Amino acid sequence: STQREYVFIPITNSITIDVKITIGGSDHITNIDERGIHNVLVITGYAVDEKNGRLVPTLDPCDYVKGILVAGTPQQAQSNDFLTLKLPANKLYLIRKKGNISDDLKIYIPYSSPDARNSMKTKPVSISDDTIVNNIIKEVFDKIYNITQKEKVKIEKVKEDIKELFSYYALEQ
Amino acid sequence: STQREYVFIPITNSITIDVKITIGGSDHITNIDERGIHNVLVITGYAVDEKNGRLVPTLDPCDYVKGILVAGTPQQAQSNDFLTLKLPANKLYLIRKKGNISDDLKIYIPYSSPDARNSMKTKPVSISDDTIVNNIIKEVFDKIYNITQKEKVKIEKVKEDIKELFSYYALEQ
Amino acid sequence: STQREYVFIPITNSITIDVKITIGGSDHITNIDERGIHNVLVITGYAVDEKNGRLVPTLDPCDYVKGILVAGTPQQAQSNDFLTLKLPANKLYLIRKKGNISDDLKIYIPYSSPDARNSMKTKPVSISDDTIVNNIIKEVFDKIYNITQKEKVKIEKVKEDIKELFSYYALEQ
Amino acid sequence: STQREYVFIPITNSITIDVKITIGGSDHITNIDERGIHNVLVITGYAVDEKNGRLVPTLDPCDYVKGILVAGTPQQAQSNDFLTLKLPANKLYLIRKKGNISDDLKIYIPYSSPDARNSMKTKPVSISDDTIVNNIIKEVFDKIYNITQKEKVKIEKVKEDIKELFSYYALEQ
Amino acid sequence: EELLMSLKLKALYPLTGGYNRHSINPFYEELVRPTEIKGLWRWWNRVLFNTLAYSTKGKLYTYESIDRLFEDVFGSENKKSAVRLEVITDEGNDNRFELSYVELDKVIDCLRNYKRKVSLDFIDNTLIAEIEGSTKIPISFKSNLDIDKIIKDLVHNNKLLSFELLGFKSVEIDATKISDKKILKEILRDLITNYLEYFNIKQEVTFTLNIYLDKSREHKQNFEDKLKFALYSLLVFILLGGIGRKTSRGFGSLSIIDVKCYDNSICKKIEDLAKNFLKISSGNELKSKIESILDCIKNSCIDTLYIENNILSEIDPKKNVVYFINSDLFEVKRINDKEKVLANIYKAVSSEGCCIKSIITDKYVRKSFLIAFGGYRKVEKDKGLDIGFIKNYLCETCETVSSFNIVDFLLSEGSFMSDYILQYEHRNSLLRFKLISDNSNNSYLIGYILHSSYFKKIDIKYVRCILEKLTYCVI
């Protein structure tokens, strides 16, 4: 059918080495369509674990992480750490939704143990201080997408829309 | 990058010797799409000198001129007097905008030195005497936009607006 | 006839070596009469050229420069790179008009080439850094008017006026 | 927390040694802000005792003494004469209420025993004779409100009112 | 007669309007209007009373009858209000808009003998005067108000503000006939004043609301409990509503700073219950506090004691429309930035906003949803999209694929509620947003949906998690 993987966008660079396939298939729900990013997924209650970057699943609805989802397979020696699961594409909190759904898809999500060893003083953060948008164009929007520098010129578009769209919660301990 | 050039429209025809480009590139700004004219650039602080009209520059904001701006190089008999410049497509003042442009343009302006030999007392001139109109749509809106008569057949749309949208200030000398 | 050169007034200091004539005869338009500067002129659509800033003609109507209009010839080696023009004194966008003039004048405004290689996005610039205006004090208004420190003892008003009234746009490149 | 002293304003120079603090906290209740006095406090049923001037309680609502609320503690030379009290900042009759309150304030008013050995029949007194006004500026508005001579050149602004507002009653015995 | 309580409040970006529809005018500045506080207190009180009456009796009473029941505290044409409001805005001394000078006589030049529309725009940090006759003269001026360069951006970014700015921006000057220069000068001068006063928007207006009580008005029948209910309504107003213009979109949002009772026997259960908001660590804590106060008045507090009086009047279902609070719909999210939140409210509530577009599809229900929850909108029967489709997604008969059916909204049989929903221009929005802060630097976005009386037993489940999704996308 259709398998994808949801990768997060933090202020940290804990993304470059955990993945095997970037595209793989022939379609990507997340898009870059001459306006900005489309079909961004947000997950409630999960808080990033940037040191060994994964989403620690908390049950606080006020916490959230939003990222992109592109097809592939995450470095087969897995399924002991990640959360992989299929859904009918409609119970996804997909924001800036442009495209429709196949109402079935199996997506891998970076999971981490709940970490019952500290007090989870989660903390909200967003992307600013443009220095760290350089590397976010470097390692998520080039390593994965073939569109950058190939079809579209408006890249400061995907500068401000990425540092305006994306926000999340960290654990800071 | 890109290349464009402005063409003025007085009530006297002297723009037969005109733009290099009939196709040239892959774009036009003053597009007339079944709703009338669009993107008529306005130049404040100039006056028009219809006798081989080059825009005499005043220092008055009330002195303005409205004309077309199409992608092209003037005549190969220029770059001696025509002032050309480059701006990020947002300092120019168009009217009836529909689309947006590619963040930079390099534009040819048919220019004249202020010619300090005759006091610039201007006169506001409109475009009436449709005999001037009935032909102008064949010199500028056919030699460039012969889109009309096969892609457009409602000239009245882009006729009456021509006799109200367009006006200018002619320095009377 | 009677002529006037227009001196710019940025926060820059290319102020001293630009002029030939201070008074010429006995009359000017910029006056300092116990209420501030008067008859100040504004150029619509031109911006400064920081590398010895002489007004490069942009097309932005929302671009402007203010300054002092004083009678005289620019440098007696010029009349090769400027805008020489004369128009009947009613097409001058003035500010704080304390009088009116004899319906004709001939102006020298410092021109600069359009420099058709760099998209010159323009930045608004005001008078700040009270040291800058305190330096400008003895720069030109004394090179122009000896009346300074002879009738206006409360030049702070004048001072404030330089900050109150002299904003412009700057080439930024 | 917060404490103030009530300095009543008689014609007498008997109000010099009344102080222990200049500011203490970060605020004075009374204000003199380019329009004159503000937040003036009235105490009714009290007549001044200009014989070493303090406030003496009577049983007459037509007797009243106006004054100001300076921040501080009285003299350290007390606990036998003055009367301290804590009031929720709305049980004060403030003439010319300019701002707001903090809803609980401790105050010291200069109190004197009623001295029941002579009939305490008091009479009104208005502060006239502007030389005492010009020296009470020195006394109370240049020892505490040194804004006088600092920013506020309009000290006649407070002459006009000290000659017209700060009236009181006095035993005159 | 005696001070009852004192509330130090704080409003964020209030859009208070005076006689010129602005918070400032040539004569005075007024950021908080006590008359608006009184009117909104009465409006929230009626909402809260119908809420109560519906959570116990399932009955809804007209606003006339509710205010006739409370006329012993709020007063009416037959009785003077027992409560006296006294706003004290600190710094509230003499301030007014003064246009020291505006350098026209150049705009007047390019205007004569013509009929042109003179538009304004205040971004670029310099006032320009666009003319639809194709010229844009930059205007020099000096005013008394210093637009902080944050307000220009707050107005230019917020698509709602820049929309309500169209009315304070232009004049269509006709100089064809006899037109001197002086009267054109005064015309443009008043236009500039009207445009510049709009930017008097301050952040964090702070005022003290005193409440005085006339004791002479005795405990006639049920004065003490009516008063306690009114004080609860005032707390609910301070918690869920704001002052001024467009409070349904976060502007003018109120926040408690300090409450002080002065008559324990009446208000000492509001003093502490508002102390319950001086420190809000997380969103869940706040939602819990709000549900606490909401439930307190619902069953635990006073009782049906004065609802048993036979002065109320049940509403007609098809000729009346009243609002009441629904405890379920109370999403709370942490803010981290107020200006951007206010700007994203437009993404939430606009038919082409890229948050409800990403939460609702088919667009028809979308229109329907907003038309049922976004106040009045200007839909007109020209291009089919209104024909049937949105009429269908509002039928109280006829299907159940839409979770909201307006009571008497009929298929081609519109009698009253059809016109009221589609034509009545002054309709408040049920979907509302608010922003709160405490003495700490914690800020939260409440999004709630008041329950109306034209919903034929709305599906409280579909719209509920629409609201969490909206509250997420806009923060």
Pairing of strands E2-12, E205-213: antiparallel
Judged on CB neighbours under 10 Å (0-12, 13-18, 19+), A56 is buried
For residue B65, what are the β-bridge partners? B43, B168
Tokens of E341: 């939140």
Query: What burial class does residue C105 get, using C-beta atoms within 10 Å of its C-beta: 0-12 exposed, 13-18 middle, 19+ buried?
Result: buried
Q: CB-based burial of residue C116 (10 Å sphere; 0-12 exposed, 13-18 middle, 19+ buried)?
A: middle
Q: In whole angstroms, what is the distance from residue D41 CA to residue A49 CA?
A: 62
Q: CB of C86 within 8 A of CB of B120?
A: yes
Binning chain D into helix, strand and coil, the percentages to the nearest 5 are: 10, 25, 60
The CA distance from B48 to B172, in Å, is: 9
Residue A128: both structure tokens together: 């600013």
- Strand D3-8 with D105-109, pairing: parallel
Q: Among partner residues E105, E106, E128, which is closest to C62 by beta-carbon distance?
A: E128
Query: Which distant-in-sequence residues (6+ apart) come within 8 Å of D77 by Cβ?
Result: none
The residue type found at D90 is N
Residues E83 and E230: their CA atoms lie apart, in Å, by 10
Instruction: Count CB neighbours of D90 within 10 A.
Output: 15
Rounded to an integer, what distance in angstroms lies between the CA atom of residue B47 and that of residue B31? 25
Residue E356 in tokens: 């409800």
Neighbours of D132 (CB within 10 A): 17
B62/E134 touch (CB, cutoff 8 Å), yes or no? no
D88 interaction partners in chain E (CB closer than 8 Å): 260, 262
Say yes or no: E264 contacts chain D, CB-CB below 8 A.
no
Query: Minimal CA–CA distance to E279: which of E270, E289, E269?
Result: E289
Q: E430-441 b/e with 16+ CB inside 10 Å = b?
A: bbbbbbbbbeee
Are C and D touching by the rule of 3+ CB pairs within 8 Å?
Answer: no
CA of A7 vs chain B CAs: smallest distance (Å):
31
Supply the DSSP symbol for B2. -
Tokens of C124: 């608004």
* Out of C61, C83, C116, closest to residue B61 by CB: C61
Distance CA C106, CA C72 (A): 10
Q: Which of E211, E202, E198, E181 is nearest to E74 (CA)?
A: E211
The answer to whether the beta carbons of residues C58 and C47 sit under 8 Å apart is: yes
* Secondary structure (H, E, C), E356-371: CCCCCCCCHHHHHHHH
Unique residue bearing structure tokens 């220095």 = A131
Per the DSSP assignment, residues forming a β-bridge with D67 are D8, D41
Host H or E run for residue E234: helix E223-240
Judge whether C70 and C41 are in contact, CB under 8 Å: no
Strands E2-12 and E253-261: antiparallel
E135-138 and E128-131 strand pairing: antiparallel
Q: How far is CA E245 from CA E16, E208, E253, in A?
A: 6, 20, 10
Instruction: Supply φ then ψ for residue E287, to 5 degrees.
Output: -60, -35
B-chain residues within 8 Å CB-CB of C91?
58-60, 62-63, 120, 122
Q: Is B102 on the interface with A (CB under 8 A)?
A: yes
Inter-chain touch C44–B60, beta carbons under 8 Å? yes
The answer to whether residues C10 and C53 touch, using CB atoms and an 8 Å cutoff, is yes
* DSSP at A38: E
Please, which residues bridge with residue B7 across strands? B68
DSSP letters along C29-50, please?
S--B-SS-B-SEEEEESEE--S
CB distance D159 to D130 below 8 Å: yes
Rounded CA-CA distance B28/B7 in Å is: 13
Q: Number of H helices and number of E strands within chain C?
A: 3, 10
Q: How far is B103 from chain C (nearest CA, A)?
A: 10
Q: Do C60 and B92 touch (CB under 8 A)?
A: yes
Find chain D residues with C-beta within 8 A of E205's C-beta: none
CB-based burial, E100-125: b 16+ in 10 Å, e otherwise: eebbbebbbbbbeeeebebbbbbeee
- Residue E54 phi, psi (nearest 5): -90, -25
- The CA distance from B27 to B86, in Å, is 17
CA distance D135 to D9: 12
Q: Quote the CA–CA distance of E457 and E451 in Å, as a whole number.
A: 10
Resolution in A: 2.4
Compute the distance between CA of residue E5 and CA of residue E7 in angstroms, rounded to an integer: 7
| AA letter at B72 | G
Q: Do chains A and D touch (3 or more CB pairs under 8 A)?
A: no
Q: Do E284 and A60 touch (CB under 8 A)?
A: yes
**What whole-number distance in Å separates Cα of residue E215 and Cα of residue E4?**
10
Q: What are the φ/ψ torsions at residue A132 (nearest 5 degrees)?
A: -95, 10
Grouping H, G, I as helix, E, B as strand and the rest as coil, residue E269 is helix
> Is B112 touching C (CB cutoff 8 A)?
no
**Please, do chains D and E touch (3+ CB pairs < 8 Å)?**
yes
Residue whose token pair is 């009577």:
D58
Taking the C-alpha atoms of residue C8 and residue D105, their distance in angstroms, rounded to an integer, is 59
Of B54, B37, B13, B29, nearest to B139 (Cα)? B13
Q: Which amino acid is at E233?
A: S
CA-to-CA distance for E39 and E35, rounded, in angstroms? 6
φ and ψ of E259, to 5 deg: -120, 140
Which residues are registered as beta bridge partners of D51? none
Contact C58/B at CB under 8 A:
yes
Q: Do E136 and B93 touch (CB under 8 A)?
A: yes
Dihedral sign (CA E392, E393, E398, E404): negative
Provide the residue type at B11 as one letter: I
Pairing status of strand B83-87 against strand B105-109: antiparallel
Closest B-chain CA to C82: B113
> For residue B120, which phi and psi values (nearest 5 degrees)?
-80, 85
Per the CB < 8 Å rule, is E358 touching A96? Answer: yes
- H-run or E-run covering D160: helix D156-162
Q: How open is the CA angle E191-E192-E193, to the nearest 5 degrees?
A: 90
CA angle E343, E152, E426 (to 5 degrees): 55
Cα–Cα distance for residue pair E347/E357, rounded to 1 Å: 9
**Residue C28: closest CA among C140, C167, C153, C159:** C140
Q: Which of A82, A100, A120 is nearest to A5 (CA)?
A: A82
Helix (H, G, I), strand (E, B) or coil at B67: strand
Question: What does the block give as tokens for D136?
Answer: 């009470």
Residue owning tokens 């967003």: A126
Q: Which amino acid is at E138?
A: P
Euclidean distance between CA atoms E24 and E31, whole angstroms: 8
Q: Smallest CA–CA separation between E126 and chain B, in Å?
A: 15
Tokens in use for B13? 């025809």
SS3 (DSSP) at D95: strand
CA-based nearest residue in chain E for residue C92? E106
Which letter, b or e, does each residue of D36-73 get, where b requires 16 or more Cβ atoms within 10 Å of its Cβ? Answer: bbbbbbebebbbbbbeebbbbbbeeeebbbbbbbbbbb
Q: Can you state the angle between helices E364-373 and E462-473, rounded to 10 degrees?
A: 90
The nearest CA of chain E is from the CA of D128 a distance in Å of 29
CB-based contact, E206 to chain D, within 8 Å: no
Instruction: Give the separation between CA C64 and CA C9, rounded to whole angstroms.
Output: 12
Angstrom distances, CA of residue E320 to CA of C90, D18, E386, E407, E412: 65, 69, 24, 11, 21
What is the distance between the alpha carbons of residues E343 and A90, in angstroms, rounded to a whole number?
A: 27
Rounded to a whole number of angstroms, the distance from the CA of C156 to the nearest CA of chain B is: 31
Burial class (CB in 10 A: 0-12, 13-18, 19+), E265: exposed
Decide: E129 and B61 in contact? Cβ < 8 Å.
no
Nearest to C164 among E135, E138, E142 (CB): E142
CA dist list (Å): E356 to A157, B60, E161, E365, E439: 22, 48, 20, 11, 33
Whole-number Å distance between alpha carbons of E382 and C137: 67
Inter-chain residue contact E137 with C44, CB threshold 8 Å = yes
* Record: contact C93-B60, CB cut-off 8 A: yes
> Which residues in chain B are closer than 8 Å to C87, comparing Cβ atoms?
58-60, 119-121
What approach was used to elucidate this structure? cryo-EM
CA B73, CA E54: separation in Å to the nearest integer? 75
Task: Kindly state the greatest CA–CA separation across chain C.
Answer: 49
Which candidate, E400, E468, E450, E371, places its Cα nearest to that of E54?
E450
The C-alpha atoms of residue A49 and residue A122 are separated, in whole angstroms, by: 10
**E316: DSSP letter:** P
Q: Could you tell me the CA-to-CA distances from D113 to C123, D52, E51, E168 in Å, in that order?
A: 73, 12, 61, 66
For residues E110 and B145, give the distance between their C-alpha atoms in angstroms, rounded to a whole number. 33
Q: Tell me which residue of C58, E132, C173, A154 sits closest to B90, measured CA to CA.
A: C58
C-alpha dihedral (D81, D87, D89, D90), degrees to nearest 10: -110
Mutate which of C87, C92, C93 to test chain E, going by most E C-beta atoms within 10 A?
A: C93
**Token output for D117:** 């050995």
- After which residues does chain B have a break in its backbone, defined as C to next N over 2.5 Å? none
CA nearest C20: which of C75, C61, C69, C59? Answer: C75
Q: Which two tokens stand for residue E141?
A: 């001026």
DSSP characters over D54-72: -EEE-S-TT-EEEEEEEES
Chain A residues whose beta carbon lies within 8 Å of the beta carbon of residue E354: 96
Q: How far apart are CA E450 and CA E466, in angstroms?
A: 14
Instruction: Find out whether E4 and E212 touch, Cβ atoms under 8 Å.
Output: yes
Nearest-Cα distance to chain A for E255, in Å, is 21
Under 8 Å between Cβ of E56 and E48:
no
Report the SS3 class of residue E389: helix
Compute the distance between CA of residue A131 and CA of residue A114 in angstroms, rounded to an integer.
31
Residues forming a β-bridge with D71: D4
Q: Can you read off the two tokens belonging to residue E264?
A: 């324990």
Among residues 93-112 of chain E, which lie with CB inside 8 Å of chain B? 106, 109-110
Interface test with B, best of C8, C43, C59, C117 (most B CBs within 10 A): C59
Residue of E nearest to A59 (CA): E284
Please state, in angstroms and rounded to a whole number, the distance separating the CA atoms of residues D56 and D45: 9
- Amino acid identity, residue E31? L
Q: Which amino acid is at E186?
A: E
**Other beta carbons within 10 Å of C170:** 20
Amino acid at E271: E
Indicate the residue type of D121: K
| SS3 category, C157 | helix
Distances (CA, A) of E258 to D102, E67, E92: 10, 29, 19
Distances (CA, A) of D140 to B83, D54, D147: 73, 16, 12
E71 neighbors E79 (Cβ within 8 angstroms):
yes
Interface of A with B in 130-159 (CB under 8 A): 153-154
Q: Do D103 and E90 touch (CB under 8 A)?
A: no
What residues of chain C lie within 8 A of the CB of E126, using their CB?
A: 62, 64, 124, 167
Residue of E107, E134, E176 for testing the chain B interface, max B β-carbons within 10 Å: E134
Asked if B61 and C44 touch (Cβ cutoff 8 Å), the reply is yes
Q: Apex CA B82: angle with CA B77 and CA B86, to 5°?
A: 120
Inter-residue contact C18 to C75 (CB < 8 Å): yes
Residue type, C46: Y
Name which of A6, A29, A2, A3 is nearest A111 in CA terms: A6
**How far is CA D127 from its chain centroid?**
13
Q: How far apart are CA D131 and CA D154, in angstroms?
A: 17
Interchain pair B42, E109: CB under 8 A:
no
After which residues does chain C become discontinuous at a C–N distance over 2.5 Å? none
Of E282, E357, E469, the CB nearest to A62: E282
**Residue D35 · residue D8 · CB < 8 Å:** no
With CB atoms and an 8 Å threshold, state whether B61 touches E136.
yes
Asked if E472 and A60 come within 8 Å (Cβ–Cβ), the reply is no
- B–E interface: beta-carbon pairs under 8 A: 23
Rounded Cα distance between C4 and E282, Å, is 68
Contact list, B102 vs chain A (CB under 8 Å): 153
Distance (Å, whole) CA E120 – CA E130: 6
Question: What six digits make up the tokens of D161?
Answer: 């009112």
E236: nearest Cα among E450, E85, E428: E450
E352 burial class (0-12, 13-18, 19+ CB within 10 angstroms)?
exposed
Angle of the E223-240 helix axis to the E283-295 helix axis, nearest 10: 160
Whole-angstrom Cα Rg for chain D? 15
Those residues whose C-beta lies under 8 Å from the C-beta of residue B15, and which sit 6 or more positions away, are: B7, B8, B9, B53, B139, B140
Q: How would DSSP label each residue in E29-98?
A: B-SS-HHHHHHHHHHHHHHHHHHHHHHHT---B-HHHHHHHSTTTS-BTTB--SEEEEEEETT-SS----
Question: Are E125 and C64 a contacting pair at CB < 8 A?
Answer: no
Report the Cα–Cα distance between both ends of chain B, in Å, rounded.
38
**E258: exposed, middle or buried (Cβ count in 10 Å: 0-12, 13-18, 19+):** middle
Whether residue B46 lies within 8 A of chain E, CB to CB, comes out as no
How many whole angstroms separate alpha carbon C70 and alpha carbon C4? 5
Write out the two tokens for D110: 């200069």
For E283, the closest chain A residue by CA position comes to: A62
Distances A150 to A32, A153, B101, B104 between C-alpha atoms, Å:
12, 8, 19, 19
